[PDB]
Design a protein around this ligand. Structure first.
Ligand SMILES: O=C(NO)N[C@H](Cc1ccccc1)C(=O)O
Ligand SMILES: [Zn+2]
Length: 307
Protein backbone atom coordinates (compact mmCIF):
# COMPACT_ATOMS: atom_id res chain seq x y z
CA UNK A 1 0.00 0.00 0.00
CA UNK A 2 1.44 3.35 -1.14
CA UNK A 3 -1.57 5.41 -0.05
CA UNK A 4 -4.31 4.91 2.54
CA UNK A 5 -6.48 4.74 -0.58
CA UNK A 6 -4.83 1.52 -1.80
CA UNK A 7 -4.80 -0.11 1.63
CA UNK A 8 -7.02 -3.21 1.87
CA UNK A 9 -9.53 -2.57 4.67
CA UNK A 10 -11.28 -5.87 3.89
CA UNK A 11 -8.47 -8.12 5.14
CA UNK A 12 -6.49 -8.73 8.35
CA UNK A 13 -3.06 -7.13 8.72
CA UNK A 14 0.22 -7.57 10.60
CA UNK A 15 1.76 -5.16 13.12
CA UNK A 16 4.19 -3.68 10.56
CA UNK A 17 1.43 -3.03 8.04
CA UNK A 18 -0.71 -1.27 10.65
CA UNK A 19 2.23 0.85 11.83
CA UNK A 20 3.16 1.81 8.25
CA UNK A 21 -0.50 2.74 7.71
CA UNK A 22 -0.28 5.22 10.58
CA UNK A 23 2.59 7.17 9.02
CA UNK A 24 0.84 7.29 5.65
CA UNK A 25 -2.31 8.72 7.25
CA UNK A 26 -0.29 11.37 9.13
CA UNK A 27 1.60 12.28 5.95
CA UNK A 28 -1.67 12.61 4.02
CA UNK A 29 -3.54 14.71 6.62
CA UNK A 30 -0.79 16.54 8.57
CA UNK A 31 -3.19 19.30 9.59
CA UNK A 32 -5.60 16.85 11.20
CA UNK A 33 -3.72 13.79 12.47
CA UNK A 34 -0.54 13.34 14.51
CA UNK A 35 1.14 10.20 15.86
CA UNK A 36 2.19 10.12 19.52
CA UNK A 37 4.30 7.53 21.34
CA UNK A 38 3.08 7.04 24.92
CA UNK A 39 5.51 4.26 25.83
CA UNK A 40 7.14 0.96 24.88
CA UNK A 41 5.80 -2.57 25.34
CA UNK A 42 7.47 -5.22 27.48
CA UNK A 43 9.32 -6.50 24.42
CA UNK A 44 10.36 -2.99 23.37
CA UNK A 45 7.75 -2.29 20.67
CA UNK A 46 6.57 1.32 20.48
CA UNK A 47 3.05 2.07 21.70
CA UNK A 48 1.33 4.54 19.37
CA UNK A 49 -1.75 6.72 19.75
CA UNK A 50 -3.28 8.71 16.89
CA UNK A 51 -4.56 12.18 17.74
CA UNK A 52 -7.26 13.80 15.61
CA UNK A 53 -7.61 17.54 16.22
CA UNK A 54 -8.55 20.75 14.41
CA UNK A 55 -6.71 22.95 16.91
CA UNK A 56 -7.14 24.47 20.34
CA UNK A 57 -5.22 23.73 23.52
CA UNK A 58 -6.18 20.72 25.63
CA UNK A 59 -9.76 20.56 24.31
CA UNK A 60 -12.21 18.09 25.88
CA UNK A 61 -11.15 14.68 24.57
CA UNK A 62 -12.52 11.27 23.64
CA UNK A 63 -10.40 8.14 24.23
CA UNK A 64 -10.75 4.93 22.21
CA UNK A 65 -8.58 1.85 22.68
CA UNK A 66 -8.80 -1.37 20.70
CA UNK A 67 -6.99 -4.70 20.85
CA UNK A 68 -6.11 -4.84 24.56
CA UNK A 69 -6.91 -8.56 24.16
CA UNK A 70 -4.69 -9.53 21.21
CA UNK A 71 -6.75 -12.39 19.74
CA UNK A 72 -9.72 -10.08 19.12
CA UNK A 73 -8.56 -9.22 15.57
CA UNK A 74 -11.85 -7.60 14.58
CA UNK A 75 -11.01 -4.67 16.91
CA UNK A 76 -7.62 -3.71 15.40
CA UNK A 77 -9.19 -4.08 11.94
CA UNK A 78 -12.02 -1.78 13.02
CA UNK A 79 -9.53 0.71 14.44
CA UNK A 80 -7.72 1.11 11.12
CA UNK A 81 -11.06 1.67 9.35
CA UNK A 82 -12.01 4.23 12.02
CA UNK A 83 -8.81 6.25 11.52
CA UNK A 84 -9.45 6.48 7.77
CA UNK A 85 -13.14 7.27 8.31
CA UNK A 86 -12.30 10.28 10.51
CA UNK A 87 -10.23 11.90 7.77
CA UNK A 88 -12.92 11.32 5.14
CA UNK A 89 -15.99 12.43 7.10
CA UNK A 90 -14.60 15.68 8.51
CA UNK A 91 -16.16 18.44 6.43
CA UNK A 92 -18.63 16.03 4.80
CA UNK A 93 -20.76 14.82 7.70
CA UNK A 94 -22.29 17.71 9.73
CA UNK A 95 -22.51 15.71 12.94
CA UNK A 96 -18.92 14.43 13.00
CA UNK A 97 -17.62 17.77 11.75
CA UNK A 98 -19.19 19.58 14.71
CA UNK A 99 -17.63 17.04 17.08
CA UNK A 100 -14.10 17.49 15.73
CA UNK A 101 -14.42 21.29 15.67
CA UNK A 102 -14.85 21.23 19.45
CA UNK A 103 -13.19 18.03 20.67
CA UNK A 104 -10.04 15.96 20.10
CA UNK A 105 -10.06 12.20 19.59
CA UNK A 106 -7.31 9.85 20.74
CA UNK A 107 -7.23 6.44 19.05
CA UNK A 108 -5.02 3.54 20.14
CA UNK A 109 -5.37 0.84 17.47
CA UNK A 110 -2.92 -1.69 18.96
CA UNK A 111 -3.01 -1.46 22.77
CA UNK A 112 -1.21 -4.80 23.22
CA UNK A 113 1.42 -5.04 20.43
CA UNK A 114 3.47 -7.87 21.98
CA UNK A 115 0.38 -10.06 22.16
CA UNK A 116 -0.71 -9.09 18.65
CA UNK A 117 2.64 -10.18 17.15
CA UNK A 118 2.40 -13.49 19.01
CA UNK A 119 -1.09 -14.22 17.60
CA UNK A 120 0.43 -13.85 14.12
CA UNK A 121 3.56 -15.86 14.93
CA UNK A 122 2.82 -18.62 17.44
CA UNK A 123 -0.70 -18.75 18.87
CA UNK A 124 -3.73 -17.17 17.17
CA UNK A 125 -5.79 -17.33 20.38
CA UNK A 126 -3.35 -15.67 22.80
CA UNK A 127 -5.02 -12.84 24.75
CA UNK A 128 -2.58 -11.65 27.44
CA UNK A 129 0.56 -9.51 27.32
CA UNK A 130 3.99 -11.16 27.13
CA UNK A 131 5.64 -10.13 30.41
CA UNK A 132 7.73 -12.67 32.34
CA UNK A 133 6.86 -13.52 35.95
CA UNK A 134 9.61 -13.90 38.56
CA UNK A 135 8.70 -17.33 39.92
CA UNK A 136 6.71 -19.09 37.18
CA UNK A 137 7.07 -20.57 33.71
CA UNK A 138 3.85 -18.94 32.54
CA UNK A 139 3.86 -15.73 30.53
CA UNK A 140 1.56 -12.71 30.47
CA UNK A 141 -1.16 -10.78 32.25
CA UNK A 142 -4.79 -10.07 31.32
CA UNK A 143 -4.37 -6.36 30.61
CA UNK A 144 -8.08 -5.74 31.26
CA UNK A 145 -7.82 -6.98 34.86
CA UNK A 146 -4.62 -5.08 35.69
CA UNK A 147 -6.27 -1.67 36.29
CA UNK A 148 -6.60 0.01 39.69
CA UNK A 149 -10.34 -0.59 40.15
CA UNK A 150 -11.23 -3.30 42.64
CA UNK A 151 -7.84 -4.78 41.75
CA UNK A 152 -7.19 -8.30 43.01
CA UNK A 153 -10.83 -8.83 43.97
CA UNK A 154 -13.21 -11.54 42.80
CA UNK A 155 -13.43 -11.66 39.02
CA UNK A 156 -9.75 -12.21 38.26
CA UNK A 157 -7.14 -14.90 38.97
CA UNK A 158 -4.03 -14.71 41.15
CA UNK A 159 -2.44 -17.60 39.24
CA UNK A 160 0.21 -16.52 36.66
CA UNK A 161 -0.82 -19.36 34.32
CA UNK A 162 -4.46 -18.27 34.24
CA UNK A 163 -6.02 -16.68 31.16
CA UNK A 164 -7.41 -14.04 33.53
CA UNK A 165 -4.27 -13.45 35.64
CA UNK A 166 -4.47 -9.90 37.06
CA UNK A 167 -0.73 -9.41 37.57
CA UNK A 168 1.57 -8.67 40.50
CA UNK A 169 -0.02 -5.30 41.28
CA UNK A 170 -2.26 -2.65 39.77
CA UNK A 171 -0.68 -1.02 36.71
CA UNK A 172 2.21 -3.50 36.71
CA UNK A 173 1.91 -3.90 32.92
CA UNK A 174 3.65 -1.10 31.03
CA UNK A 175 0.94 -1.23 28.33
CA UNK A 176 -1.59 -0.20 31.00
CA UNK A 177 0.49 2.27 33.01
CA UNK A 178 1.32 4.11 29.77
CA UNK A 179 -2.37 4.83 29.28
CA UNK A 180 -2.95 5.70 32.94
CA UNK A 181 -0.19 8.35 33.03
CA UNK A 182 -1.22 9.83 29.70
CA UNK A 183 -4.88 10.20 30.67
CA UNK A 184 -4.07 11.58 34.14
CA UNK A 185 -1.54 14.08 32.78
CA UNK A 186 -4.02 15.23 30.10
CA UNK A 187 -6.80 15.65 32.65
CA UNK A 188 -9.53 16.72 30.22
CA UNK A 189 -11.01 13.47 28.88
CA UNK A 190 -14.83 13.31 28.77
CA UNK A 191 -15.37 9.85 27.27
CA UNK A 192 -13.43 6.59 27.48
CA UNK A 193 -14.26 3.66 25.16
CA UNK A 194 -12.68 0.19 25.04
CA UNK A 195 -13.38 -2.08 22.05
CA UNK A 196 -13.44 -5.88 22.40
CA UNK A 197 -15.05 -9.00 20.87
CA UNK A 198 -17.12 -11.03 20.85
CA UNK A 199 -20.76 -11.34 22.05
CA UNK A 200 -22.37 -8.13 20.69
CA UNK A 201 -22.78 -6.16 23.92
CA UNK A 202 -22.51 -2.53 25.05
CA UNK A 203 -21.50 -2.21 28.70
CA UNK A 204 -21.06 0.49 31.35
CA UNK A 205 -19.63 0.34 34.94
CA UNK A 206 -19.27 -1.48 37.18
CA UNK A 207 -17.82 -4.96 36.87
CA UNK A 208 -16.06 -5.39 40.22
CA UNK A 209 -18.87 -4.26 42.56
CA UNK A 210 -22.65 -4.76 42.65
CA UNK A 211 -22.97 -1.07 43.52
CA UNK A 212 -24.88 1.00 40.94
CA UNK A 213 -23.22 4.08 39.47
CA UNK A 214 -24.77 7.52 40.22
CA UNK A 215 -25.20 8.12 36.48
CA UNK A 216 -26.93 4.82 35.71
CA UNK A 217 -30.11 6.38 34.30
CA UNK A 218 -28.25 8.57 31.79
CA UNK A 219 -25.69 6.02 30.58
CA UNK A 220 -28.41 3.41 30.25
CA UNK A 221 -30.38 5.65 27.86
CA UNK A 222 -27.21 6.60 25.98
CA UNK A 223 -26.42 2.89 25.60
CA UNK A 224 -29.95 2.14 24.41
CA UNK A 225 -29.73 4.85 21.73
CA UNK A 226 -26.32 3.66 20.60
CA UNK A 227 -27.46 0.06 20.02
CA UNK A 228 -30.57 1.24 18.17
CA UNK A 229 -28.34 3.29 15.87
CA UNK A 230 -25.93 0.38 15.39
CA UNK A 231 -28.74 -2.07 14.54
CA UNK A 232 -30.27 0.21 11.89
CA UNK A 233 -27.63 -0.68 9.29
CA UNK A 234 -27.62 -4.49 9.08
CA UNK A 235 -29.95 -5.50 11.90
CA UNK A 236 -27.21 -6.71 14.24
CA UNK A 237 -28.68 -7.20 17.73
CA UNK A 238 -26.86 -5.89 20.81
CA UNK A 239 -27.68 -6.20 24.50
CA UNK A 240 -26.68 -3.58 27.06
CA UNK A 241 -26.27 -3.00 30.78
CA UNK A 242 -23.63 -2.88 33.50
CA UNK A 243 -20.77 -5.40 33.30
CA UNK A 244 -21.61 -7.34 36.44
CA UNK A 245 -25.34 -7.74 35.65
CA UNK A 246 -24.89 -8.52 31.94
CA UNK A 247 -21.88 -10.85 32.00
CA UNK A 248 -20.50 -11.52 35.49
CA UNK A 249 -18.20 -10.03 38.12
CA UNK A 250 -14.82 -8.90 36.73
CA UNK A 251 -12.18 -6.84 38.53
CA UNK A 252 -9.43 -4.50 37.38
CA UNK A 253 -11.32 -3.33 34.30
CA UNK A 254 -10.47 -0.21 32.30
CA UNK A 255 -13.86 1.51 32.26
CA UNK A 256 -14.29 0.90 35.99
CA UNK A 257 -11.02 2.77 36.45
CA UNK A 258 -11.86 5.56 33.98
CA UNK A 259 -15.27 6.15 35.55
CA UNK A 260 -13.70 6.43 39.02
CA UNK A 261 -11.36 9.05 37.56
CA UNK A 262 -14.39 11.19 36.74
CA UNK A 263 -14.74 10.21 33.07
CA UNK A 264 -18.53 9.89 33.01
CA UNK A 265 -19.01 8.40 29.54
CA UNK A 266 -17.16 5.10 29.97
CA UNK A 267 -18.31 2.23 27.74
CA UNK A 268 -16.99 -1.14 26.61
CA UNK A 269 -18.03 -2.63 23.26
CA UNK A 270 -18.02 -6.37 22.51
CA UNK A 271 -18.34 -6.66 18.70
CA UNK A 272 -19.38 -9.49 16.33
CA UNK A 273 -20.29 -12.09 16.34
CA UNK A 274 -22.46 -14.50 18.95
CA UNK A 275 -20.30 -17.59 18.67
CA UNK A 276 -20.54 -18.92 15.12
CA UNK A 277 -16.99 -17.78 14.35
CA UNK A 278 -16.06 -16.15 17.65
CA UNK A 279 -12.57 -14.67 17.62
CA UNK A 280 -11.99 -15.97 14.09
CA UNK A 281 -14.50 -13.71 12.34
CA UNK A 282 -14.26 -13.94 8.50
CA UNK A 283 -12.46 -11.08 6.74
CA UNK A 284 -15.62 -10.38 4.74
CA UNK A 285 -17.36 -9.14 7.90
CA UNK A 286 -14.70 -6.55 8.73
CA UNK A 287 -16.23 -3.61 6.88
CA UNK A 288 -19.88 -4.30 7.81
CA UNK A 289 -18.85 -4.57 11.47
CA UNK A 290 -16.83 -1.36 11.32
CA UNK A 291 -19.65 0.51 9.56
CA UNK A 292 -22.33 -0.38 12.13
CA UNK A 293 -20.00 0.05 15.13
CA UNK A 294 -19.21 3.55 13.86
CA UNK A 295 -22.88 4.58 14.13
CA UNK A 296 -23.02 3.43 17.74
CA UNK A 297 -19.78 5.19 18.64
CA UNK A 298 -20.83 8.40 16.88
CA UNK A 299 -24.07 8.36 18.91
CA UNK A 300 -22.11 8.39 22.17
CA UNK A 301 -19.79 11.12 20.85
CA UNK A 302 -22.76 13.35 19.99
CA UNK A 303 -24.15 12.97 23.50
CA UNK A 304 -20.73 13.76 25.00
CA UNK A 305 -20.54 16.99 23.00
CA UNK A 306 -23.84 18.42 24.28
CA UNK A 307 -23.44 17.39 27.93
O1 LIG B 1 -14.60 -12.58 26.32
C1 LIG B 1 -14.28 -11.42 26.57
N1 LIG B 1 -13.85 -10.57 25.62
O2 LIG B 1 -13.51 -9.25 25.96
N2 LIG B 1 -14.32 -10.86 27.79
C2 LIG B 1 -14.76 -11.56 29.00
C3 LIG B 1 -15.97 -10.82 29.67
C4 LIG B 1 -15.79 -9.34 29.99
C5 LIG B 1 -16.01 -8.34 29.00
C6 LIG B 1 -15.83 -6.96 29.31
C7 LIG B 1 -15.42 -6.57 30.61
C8 LIG B 1 -15.20 -7.56 31.60
C9 LIG B 1 -15.38 -8.93 31.29
C10 LIG B 1 -13.57 -11.65 29.98
O3 LIG B 1 -13.54 -12.37 30.93
O4 LIG B 1 -12.55 -10.83 29.67
ZN1 LIG C 1 -11.58 -8.61 25.18
Amino acid sequence: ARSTNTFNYATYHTLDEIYDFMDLLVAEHPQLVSKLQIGRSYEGRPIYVLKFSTGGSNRPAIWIDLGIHSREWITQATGVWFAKKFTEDYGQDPSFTAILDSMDIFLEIVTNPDGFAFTHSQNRLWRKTRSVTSSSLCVGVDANRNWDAGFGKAGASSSPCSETYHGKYANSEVEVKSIVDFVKDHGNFKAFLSIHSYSQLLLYPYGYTTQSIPDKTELNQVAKSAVEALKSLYGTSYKYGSIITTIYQASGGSIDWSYNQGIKYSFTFELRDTGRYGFLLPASQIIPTAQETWLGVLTIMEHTLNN
